[PDB]
Amino acid sequence: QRLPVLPCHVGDPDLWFADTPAGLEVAKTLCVSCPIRRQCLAAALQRAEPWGVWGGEIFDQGSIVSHKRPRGRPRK
DNA sequence: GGTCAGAAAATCGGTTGTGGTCAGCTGCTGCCACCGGTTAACCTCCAATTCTGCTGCCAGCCT
Ligand code: SF4
Structure with a gap:
């Protein structure tokens, strides 16, 4: 069917919970x-x-964030 | 024109706090389901054929 065209489960599923702001960006797009x-x-x-x-x-736990905040001091 | 304390992010995790929440009985209380006993005019005995083997039976030589 249309299952291999479905971009959720095409590759490794552990990508889509990686805890870096830049790692999951290609997963989101x-x-x-x-x-x-x-x-x-x-x-x-x-x-x-x-x-x-x-x-x-x-x-996040309830809602949608725009981009995940990175580890460290945020930019002034 | 470079090094050190503070501030500010998730992050993994402990506290904690109470706010219900669900069950676990627990009486308990009514009830209901189930088992057992009892009834004192009289009237006291049932509703097909084919083949093989076994047993019961009667005349009848033999002693
Ligand atoms: S998260 Fe997005 S890409 Fe993944 S299965 Fe759902 S709709 Fe598709």
Whole structure:
């Protein structure tokens, strides 16, 4: 079916929870071409997923952050 | 025009705090399900054929 075209499970699944701001960036933008962004993002927002890339967007424990804040002192 | 204390990020983890929450009985209380005993005019005996082997039976020579 359309399973190998689905960009979620094409490669290694441990990529999409890597705890670097730059590592998961290609994981987030790899769901640009995903055919099911609407329903996946809708399910992720309704069930309140606390981790990882969902619907081509990252998640905190309840909501969506724009980009994950890096380790260290943030920029003034 | 470079080194050292403080501030500010998640991050892994302990506290903690209470706010319900669900169950675990626990009486307990009513009830309900189930088992056992009892009834004192009289009237006291049932509703097909084919083949093989076994046993019961009667005349009848033999002693
Ligand atoms: S997170 Fe995005 S890319 Fe991954 S399966 Fe869901 S919609 Fe597709």
